[PDB]
């Protein structure tokens, strides 16, 4: 299926299992993929046949910046649920939530979770 | 199937939903993948058994620089249509059109659309 | 002289000569360097003998996000003025304001202004 | 299936076919992917429904830093075996072990092995 | 199937359709993937159960540096053929040949061909 | 002195000592630095008290794309001469001309020339 | 004067003003420059006429990993003091201590302090 | 003074204090800067009034690939000596020799030496 992507959104948030993380905050990154037909939009040049990617950005920002969860899994799950609830034309989405600066002693680029969700 | 790629073509264009975007312009990037047999070319060293990637670059440039659409979907769709019309030996293509600097308040690397097209 | 740096701050702002830029906005980046004696702080481990770099970040954010100028020159000048007014222990500063996505048809990484300021 | 990732872990280790490599050591990098249901965790915000990625990091560190094998294949195989033994909720994993600085005269970014493992 | 990778080999070669390219030369890059069982190697720590990646590097170097073809397709095809001829334990390979600096007026990262080959 | 920068302009051009380079062309990059007082502009927000960096970009583009020289030295020298002739308020400039893909068999990022010029 | 550099050392440490930082830890990076005559070493090929850069690395690691300070200023100051105390042949050093993931809500690459020290 | 640069030359070499390094080899990188008047060349377009940067590359390659020293200091010193001996028009040079993959247990980008040399 055709795809809309938003790559490497960066937010500052307060999610985390440790209370110290909830106090200090840290970077969170999100990669978004949504699956939908884009042919009608590409033939007509009419945005009403697609999904406004500015709205998709704001949907992600709300989950990461305006809420606080323990788990990155909860960020991913809530983004996916909100997308499918709000956009009937999107059949499936893949949400990757990245924690690049976790409190793990060691050397690495990032930890992340990734889920793919569709309706029943 | 075997593939020809052109990675991260960069164009300056005027596409966009907002009239201000049509006035100012911005960067657009394109990733191209085309699927075709390359074995006859790889065995013969004869370009007539493949597709000249310089021509593929120019085909993309024409759509992005010489036309102006509202939607990135229209850029992708027109590139794919032109490829399949001009190159009978290409069975399928995947076109990703990237808008790295959209007028979205926030922090991210890029927004993009991606389509895969083949003939009926 | 010793230095505090903040590298590659990224803000979304509305500065620009063209009215279309003031409507759409774009990325702005800032590099900050301030010059001050750090030896008293490095020997005592007491932040009172240095300058809190979180405050320096917020000072830059206010100029870039909470105001709108025509010129990147005005962003740099106002950041430098605010630093010298507020931190008597800083003797000089260098402020670089970067516009990575200006409305210039062409291929480049960024345009920028850089100033160094001290008191009379 | 949903995934947890740890990207680009960097370790210093002593693995290698040549005895000189066992003496000098070199960088080793690991990419980890584990497959498991994350929906129960994303709905409950309860870490007991997922796998702690700090533990996954430490499991990898033990294999790369606390043991010495001739082959990168042995690093990958032991990481995969340990994951599946310790985490019943993980159904499959993909482990990539990267040797970026091998003693190969030439110019390249890295050599690597990658395996995917599941239970019988 | 398990994989051995060699990422981003860089060679200087003389391949090209235009005689001027055959005179001047340019960079060529190769990504190699070979598919084979690695479990016996990962369990035994015995290199005789795998394929020496230094030999794979040299096989690629020979094709790119010691021969001159018109087409990048010929580079890819000859590398794949040599791999399958020399290593009975490799069941399939994917060879990507990248020309990052072709004589195409325009702005892009690279052009490339990619083939996957197995025995009849 | 205060500075305006344009970083990493990329042009496709035909400069070079070898006739084959003049036929095929290649990438050329330019870094520009100009020195001028920016305080009047930063205090007034009036572009008339600075130098329009879009004009500086076009000045460089003309030299690199609309002319063909043997030497990168000639590109740099002509850019600097044109800047000083056209902008009396610029007291000095530093021009770096980069050839990232020269016909040199070997492994490197780029070759370059850099000059600093002012009036007698 | 001639220089030895160590670029972008990465350590995990517990420094910081906030108690939560001392509990969680974070990445710290260090750039080291030391100034000394290298001509005797370059003519003789005898390490006794230079300074072993592996020892310089370990000196930095001890300060960043084996101690905990409130300020990055204290890390830099102690590294510089230890270098000058231990290596009479080094006449001056520049130490840059980088905190890439501080608890500052915002978007940036890093904050840092940099000092240059010599003997009275 | 005007400059010619060659950035990030990469060679495979066998230099090192430990005998194991002389057996295995590793990457070495070199940055070259030479200072000379470029105005005569930039005005005349005649390479005879400059220094051929392809010759400078080969001069560096000979030292790094065709000789083996214990110290990176010796690589830098010999490159600088050869440049000044062979090019009377070069008045000064700065040579940086980088060892990105030394046998130092730890996490860093590279170690390096840098020297600046001129004639008596
Ligand atoms: N699966 C999963 N595992 C985790 N482990 C630890 C933490 C902590 O908040 C810190 O990131 C590291 O200790 N968070 C998570 C998490 O969100 N998901
Ligand atoms: N799917 C889709 N959504 C869009 N939303 C907004 C805009 C605007 O032109 C700007 O990019 C952002 O407001 N363009 C698009 C677009 O082309 N495609
Ligand atoms: N020195 C200087 N020159 C400029 N030229 C054009 C623009 C416009 O806003 C756009 O960035 C490009 O047309 N801004 C500036 C500016 O701030 N400073
Ligand atoms: N498949 C495989 N091949 C190898 N070839 C050589 C070496 C040596 O230790 C050095 O990396 C290079 O000579 N290691 C390996 C290895 O682990 N796996
Ligand atoms: N498929 C394919 N197309 C090509 N087109 C042009 C050239 C020329 O040598 C230059 O790269 C560009 O004109 N080479 C190729 C090639 O190898 N393969
Ligand atoms: N100083 C200087 N040296 C050069 N050497 C060779 C070439 C050739 O055109 C190719 O770039 C490499 O052979 N150009 C130059 C040049 O412009 N400047
Ligand atoms: N000069 C200087 N300023 C600082 N401000 C805040 C913090 C805190 O530990 C956090 O990094 C940010 O709040 N540390 C420092 C510091 O070490 N140095
Ligand atoms: N100044 C200087 N110090 C060194 N220390 C160790 C080694 C060894 O060969 C390895 O690189 C690291 O142990 N080489 C050097 C060197 O060339 N220069
Ligand atoms: Cl919808
Ligand atoms: Cl065709
Ligand atoms: Cl489990
Ligand atoms: Cl085999
Ligand atoms: Ni319609
Ligand atoms: Ni034929
Ligand atoms: Ni005090
Ligand atoms: Ni439960
Ligand atoms: Ni066996
Ligand atoms: Ni005025
Ligand atoms: Ni001696
Ligand atoms: Ni002459």
From TrEMBL, chains A, B, C, D, E, F, G, H:
The superkingdom listed in its UniProt entry is Bacteria
Q: What is this protein called?
A: 7,8-dihydroneopterin aldolase
One Pfam family from the record: FolB
Every copy of the Dihydroneopterin aldolase/epimerase domain together lies at 4-117
Job of this protein: Catalyzes the conversion of 7,8-dihydroneopterin to 6-hydroxymethyl-7,8-dihydropterin.
Question: What UniProt keywords apply to this chain's record, in alphabetical order?
Answer: Folate biosynthesis, Lyase
Indicate the family of this protein: Belongs to the DHNA family.
Q: Which GO terms describe its molecular function?
A: dihydroneopterin aldolase activity
> Is Lyase one of the keywords UniProt gives this record?
yes
Q: Which InterPro entries match?
A: Dihydroneopterin_aldolase (IPR006156), FolB_dom (IPR006157), GTP-CH-I_C/QueF (IPR043133)
- Reactions catalysed according to its record: 7,8-dihydroneopterin = 6-hydroxymethyl-7,8-dihydropterin + glycolaldehyde
Q: Which organism is it from?
A: Bacillus anthracis
The enzyme class is lyase
The annotated pathway is: Cofactor biosynthesis; tetrahydrofolate biosynthesis; 2-amino-4-hydroxy-6-hydroxymethyl-7,8-dihydropteridine diphosphate from 7,8-dihydroneopterin triphosphate: step 3/4
**Does the keyword Nucleotide-binding belong to this entry?**
no
The record ties this protein, via SUPFAM superfamilies, to: Tetrahydrobiopterin biosynthesis enzymes-like
Q: What gene does this protein come from?
A: folB
Q: What does UniProt give as GO cellular component? A: cytoplasm
Give the SMART domains listed for this entry.
FolB (SM00905)
């Amino acid at each position: 299926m055709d795809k809309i992507y938003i790559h490497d959104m960066e937010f500052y948030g307060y999610h985390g299992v440790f209370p110290e993380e909830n106090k200090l905050g840290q970077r969170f990154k999100v990669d978004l993929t949504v699956e939908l037909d884009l042919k009608r939009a590409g033939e007509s040049d009419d945005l009403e046949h697609s999904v406004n990617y500015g709205e998709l950005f704001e949907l992600c920002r709300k989950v990461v910046e305006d809420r606080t969860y323990k788990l990155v899994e909860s960020i991913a799950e809530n983004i996916a649920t909100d997308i499918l609830k709000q956009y009937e034309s999107i059949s499936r989405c893949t949400i990757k939530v990245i924690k690049p600066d976790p409190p793990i002693p060691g050397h690495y680029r990032a930890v992340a979770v990734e889920i793919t969700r569709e309706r029943p």
